[PDB]
Amino acid sequence: DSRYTDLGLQPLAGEWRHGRAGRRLKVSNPFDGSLLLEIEQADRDDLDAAYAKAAEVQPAWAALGPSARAAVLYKAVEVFDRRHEEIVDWIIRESGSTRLKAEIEWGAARAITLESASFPARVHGRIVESDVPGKESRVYRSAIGVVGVISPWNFPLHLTQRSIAPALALGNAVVVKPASDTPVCGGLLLARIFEEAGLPAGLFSVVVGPGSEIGDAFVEHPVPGLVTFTGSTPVGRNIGRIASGGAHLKHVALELGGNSPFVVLGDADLEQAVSAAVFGKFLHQAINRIIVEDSLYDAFAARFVERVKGLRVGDPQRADTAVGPIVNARQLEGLLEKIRLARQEGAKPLYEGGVDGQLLAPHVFGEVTATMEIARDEIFGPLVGLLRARDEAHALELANASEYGLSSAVFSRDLERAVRFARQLRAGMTHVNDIPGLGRFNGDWAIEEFTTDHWISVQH
Amino acid sequence: DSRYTDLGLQPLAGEWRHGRAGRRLKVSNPFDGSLLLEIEQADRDDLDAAYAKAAEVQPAWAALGPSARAAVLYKAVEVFDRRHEEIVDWIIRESGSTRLKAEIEWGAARAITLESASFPARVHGRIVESDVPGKESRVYRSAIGVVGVISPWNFPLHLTQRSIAPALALGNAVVVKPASDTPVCGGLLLARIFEEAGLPAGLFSVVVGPGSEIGDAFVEHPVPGLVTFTGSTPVGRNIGRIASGGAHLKHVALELGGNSPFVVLGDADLEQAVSAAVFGKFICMAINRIIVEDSLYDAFAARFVERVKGLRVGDPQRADTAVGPIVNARQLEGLLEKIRLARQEGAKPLYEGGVDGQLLAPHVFGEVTATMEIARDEIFGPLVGLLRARDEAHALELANASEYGLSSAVFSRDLERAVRFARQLRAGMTHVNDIPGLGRFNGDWAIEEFTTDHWISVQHAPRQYP
Amino acid sequence: SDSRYTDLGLQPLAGEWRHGRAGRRLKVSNPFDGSLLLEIEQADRDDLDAAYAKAAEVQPAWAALGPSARAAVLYKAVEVFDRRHEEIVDWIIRESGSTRLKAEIEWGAARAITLESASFPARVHGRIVESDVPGKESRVYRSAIGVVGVISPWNFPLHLTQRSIAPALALGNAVVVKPASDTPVCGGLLLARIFEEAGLPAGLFSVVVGPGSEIGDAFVEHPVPGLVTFTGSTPVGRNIGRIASGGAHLKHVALELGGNSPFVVLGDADLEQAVSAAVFGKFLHQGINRIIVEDSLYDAFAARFVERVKGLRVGDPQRADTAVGPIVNARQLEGLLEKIRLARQEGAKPLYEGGVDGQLLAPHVFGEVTATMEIARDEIFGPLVGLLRARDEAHALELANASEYGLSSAVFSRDLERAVRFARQLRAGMTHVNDIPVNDSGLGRFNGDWAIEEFTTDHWISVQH
Amino acid sequence: SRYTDLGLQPLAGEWRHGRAGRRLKVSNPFDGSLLLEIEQADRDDLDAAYAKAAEVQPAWAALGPSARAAVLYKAVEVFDRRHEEIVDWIIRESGSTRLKAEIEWGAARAITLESASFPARVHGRIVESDVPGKESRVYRSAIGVVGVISPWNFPLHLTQRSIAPALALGNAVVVKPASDTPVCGGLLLARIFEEAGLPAGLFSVVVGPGSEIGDAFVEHPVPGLVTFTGSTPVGRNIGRIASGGAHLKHVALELGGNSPFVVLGDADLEQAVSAAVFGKFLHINRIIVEDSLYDAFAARFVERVKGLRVGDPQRADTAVGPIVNARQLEGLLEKIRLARQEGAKPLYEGGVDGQLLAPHVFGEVTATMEIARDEIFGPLVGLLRARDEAHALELANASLSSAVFSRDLERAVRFARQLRAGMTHVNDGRFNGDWAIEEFTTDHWISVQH
């Protein structure tokens, strides 16, 4: 039917209204610079109201039967399907993501939502044995209460929904703080979807405000039982201190992005390794460093560069666009700085595409070493370094030098060797020989995350 | 210090006494035929009393804390150590087991006892939400009640303890019916060990009786919530029929021995396979068929036969003895018939050993086919058939030919291929490149087997009931 | 689609919808008016062999698909449940003679089972285990059993069939269903149509409708099925159990056997709740045979119980107001007449006796019944109930536990602590405190844990590196 | 022989003196008599302990479950073996009563026995995939090295609570004990584990000047996890150091709190009084009673409190023993004062004789008084008056553990669930394999494409 309108309105304490901060925020398309919409920012009082209301209405939401809460999640899946193109179109225009990656982001969010609908049925308390005669110990598993979610600019919709959908399903309320560049895909859109899906008012608020005023207060506030953030390391690190530093001590769930290594061993299928690297780094769902055994390195570099030159940079609305615009000026300036820093540190430039406004074309460097910043620090854009490895042991040392490892990959025709190498990696996941709810986030992970246990021992 | 005496007395309904059947069972050594002991057998009043007593005292046992029940299991481990040789000697004398096998049986039984000590603390009830307003669901996990255990002649002590120890630890009571050839090993000794370790009287009864009198009644009885059996397929078939056929219906857990295939693919390390196969066969970790890809067949057959010749057939008390006597004459007669039929069916005699009383030497046959009896039927002795496979696809057909699969093994230097092959086998367990408490057994299985769920839904609020 | 299913007499056999080759015709009739619903060409033994063989053949490809693909089919099946709601409920009433009220309940339960099962595939887990042996790893793989043979009852044919079919299929098994001769449609045939519409590949779901004489034992005896499933009468279930282990090939059997279920009312009970719960469970839902009341509340319970029961309205099941409808078949009915007559001569005090008119058998309530009497000991599948007087709590426990076999139970008392203590001593798998002993999202009984245990098996592979 | 040379520190697999060149005296709180003297450890020592733990840990983790379990079993035998010796050290060092010391010993022994089964139970998983030919394997492995910060309250038992499962699950461990209780701080636990056949280097204890090595312990790069149970202020501090430092460290934080003891109108009064006295004094900070029952409870409570002996901890009769340290006592005396100035009614006041602090009971306490609201580490308790159950709930809520007494269990359980505490005892656990395995192991997903 009709596409959502008045997206500038904020869901605050059960009502859709303007924020009272007295300042306007412009939301712009990174590609052509066009004005998408304008938002009246929210002040600190707006934040307090949203947390209070979430706390007030949450018990009644938790009191509902599991099927009732699941009905909302199923209904949200249904809205995802009806507003497919509308959702994808918002992700492209606001975040600057290509249509290919927006479609993937749509699918991921829908899948999380469908998975979460089954979670209420799976929540289970425990009855425990006791040595004391006449004593029964019962453990009740209940919702935490209110969860505060901080959204990134990178994959706002999918990464927001990854916390939002399970938290809500398991009987919590949520308040979300999106990135200033991506308020709509930061949970304003998600809030509209959950409302049409029959979520009671007040359970989901979104606070869009100046980070100077509302920033630290979001974390420090006494109401939230848990604060979740997935994204940048410096941002996450700050969230860490504010949590510990504050008068109240808050549980925080931090998933911090890292430089993730892609390792190609000597016996690897070359063509398959090259395709997987290109899909991983540029086409995307990450990969920030590619390490190749010396015997394969020269041939890998040549073929990789050849494919990367073929990658189409342009308007993200097109289905054939591989590389689109960087989301904002700050991120762009950072990537341009990393390019110049790479040059001074003596990395060999293999391919350098032209920067055209927010469109940063692929940049590939070679002869990289573990100490260079391009190896050490995380990259959020089309810049990647190629490392030479002397042997398997050297490849392992290079891969583990990153220290912080969210993901990894290893390529080798010998599966036994690949798996044995993978096990020595200091990373949470490794993908072996990957050709282009089941995996990663799981119901058991979510239930533990967004519930708490109360041990109640009863003496007869 | 002194070993157990008066083993002829039966633990029946909380007392150690004679059976009232009025008939005596002779228990004798398979090697020399010397008489070990005589037991006054139990009648059907004895069985009823044993079951009744177990049902009566079991609640108090379950009501104890996990720590108290665990304490008994720990003390049983101490007895196992102090009476090590006594136990091993009884296995050898009574069952005719070689000292080498007896030591393995001892270690296996000891490990079961230790592990089981930890089980009580892991047992967990669950609390569930409800769509009905004002309803809460509590699920309690409790002991079944009384478990009836039938012990085989093959590995009496270990296989009995594998059921007995976890069931007792988890708050059940047990009644055991041992095989007529091995009553002491099948729980008469275990009851003495558990009694020494402080198990309250009446939780563990042993019923040694005429298979005519007590046999069907033991399975048919209304008291036991579960009946467990590990051993021969025809026996298990009989137990299964009586269980479902009888007036009273109970769950039955049947672990039935079968012809288990040992598969050697083309690329396999020949020397390792042969030694593994020899150590394997010469048991309910059984190897009954050896299937080799055509390229290695002749080389495998040659090496295998030759190590087999090296195995010494002798007195089981000797530590060096590899092969010992068959448990009873009827089992020996079946093996002798199996050897006879094999020649009849066209199997090529690779090696023929002498039968000297109960001492039956290894017999190895070659060029065996799937239709031959030696391949398809279960063997409980030192008789082996070797099968030739043209390709890997043929080897898979040959391995999955047997109706009953419990264990299997695959030998190949390519682990990916070996595991891929293994996944196609119709078997519960496969060993890859290994000479056949972390495998099976384990708490999860034990808790599932010997406890049950009781759903109790509590309504705290009134219901319209349309 | 828009139009109702037609040609419901065709059997799904080995990937094809055709007539059976037995040369015998089975007539499906409405229990109420006796009218002809449809005619079925019965299946012979060759049809049975073909259905099993096809199921074995196509099952690996179904298992080899991903969890999401299998779950999609079950999501589409719920989809069909909604579009053909009234069509399904009408079939239940006409074939089984179930009331509209009970038919709606059955529809809902079946829909919920189907929807819950869609979540099951992704939850299946194998295991990785550590070894004392150096360089050794144990990997445990969890897979579908293969083919499941499902025997379905006449009482709640649709729901109880789906209770096995939906989870088994979801987890990558194939199924063959042998429904009751009185209810073949609401057995496998309507469900097979639904699953085909939802995009289930051909050959994964067969239904075999045949004379119990030839193909009866053969269904259970056959070598391909890895599991045989049955819920219903104890005598029938006993038969299935014997054939299973008695036969040449040994399979697992899962038997949920119907039994005399005790409904206990202690002295402090909420009487109106207890009475309402007893009437509604015994009549209008079931799919509770002995009522045990403490002596203090006994006479009070009997009066109110008899009073409500007399009000229960016996008639045409299509009517929304009908509480009691016809007995399914003639054999079933005149088993019930015998139970009534035997109760009288064993000395049961007849509290209320309604008139039997054709298949319509009105409620019958007896009092002062004892444990030794047949009305207490044996299960009844119909509107016949006995009331027992218990002197104290201890006596009530004894009377309830005499049954041996305890699938479900109920206890009514305002003292929740005492009710639970009593409930724990019940020899039953489920007890309901202050509510009807009626099952059921994943909250009770069927759930992923149960389903995965029942419809998958483990393969341990130890690897030496 | 009893253990000797207990002053030696297990550092990088060598027992030896600290490099810091400063000496610590460890003294009995009762007599003030000097127990032993320790050479403090420097920051160079601390770096060595972590380095050694990291290098030797893989070999320990590479062993089979049975090998690691066997060490744990031997430690249990030592606990029985040196029962009296261990109990004596607890009384001596921490000032714990003989009654309380025995409980600590029994608890610690149970932890050690529990943990022997843990190696066997740890499992990886295999997960299904939509991608054709893809298998997902998840491996469970030890964290690596775990740093444990030990308190002085129950040093022995609370240390082992972390040490035993961590070690069993194939981790290595470094312990930094409280300065008042270095021996029961795992300096002694180290000898037991050594006697039980624990390989050298896996278990290190650093006793050093809190000024130098304090923050360096938490900030260090090597430890995968840091564990601490003790004061909120002390633990709170540890929090910042974690996220404040250059690298980010996982921390497991168990912070003590004011735990409310709630007595409803229908409670059996005898059980309430007996339970209250047994809990607080014979090791709960605040007692809340409904108005109707308040006065009767208050009367009987002080009666039993009057009867407790304050004396030498070695005696089996001694109910109350000495406060561990001078601040704790001076803070204890200060806390009494401010309840005095804030207008709490003192029901019973005991005399302080040296370290020995007799029971102090106050009445008519309010939520806004520091005594109720702020954690207490001694034999000082306040009684609060509740008009109704709703008022009683509000009192308890404003405040780790809790208790509710009511003869109606349904009512008691209803109330308990509305308490936001982790644990409630009704009319009167954690640890366990599930928690331990999760805490001291980590998951590695590995996807294999065939």
From TrEMBL, chain A:
<dbReference type="InterPro" id="IPR016160">
    <property type="entry name" value="Ald_DH_CS_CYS"/>
</dbReference>
<feature type="domain" description="Aldehyde dehydrogenase">
    <location>
        <begin position="16"/>
        <end position="455"/>
    </location>
</feature>
<protein>
    <submittedName>
        <fullName>Aldehyde dehydrogenase</fullName>
        <ecNumber>1.2.1.3</ecNumber>
    </submittedName>
</protein>
<dbReference type="InterPro" id="IPR016163">
    <property type="entry name" value="Ald_DH_C"/>
</dbReference>
<dbReference type="InterPro" id="IPR016162">
    <property type="entry name" value="Ald_DH_N"/>
</dbReference>
<dbReference type="InterPro" id="IPR016161">
    <property type="entry name" value="Ald_DH/histidinol_DH"/>
</dbReference>
<feature type="active site">
    <location>
        <position position="255"/>
    </location>
</feature>
<dbReference type="Pfam" id="PF00171">
    <property type="entry name" value="Aldedh"/>
</dbReference>
<dbReference type="GO" id="GO:0004029">
    <property type="term" value="F:aldehyde dehydrogenase (NAD+) activity"/>
</dbReference>
<dbReference type="InterPro" id="IPR029510">
    <property type="entry name" value="Ald_DH_CS_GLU"/>
</dbReference>
<keyword id="KW-0520">NAD</keyword>
<comment type="similarity">
    <text>Belongs to the aldehyde dehydrogenase family.</text>
</comment>
<dbReference type="InterPro" id="IPR015590">
    <property type="entry name" value="Aldehyde_DH_dom"/>
</dbReference>
<keyword id="KW-0560">Oxidoreductase</keyword>
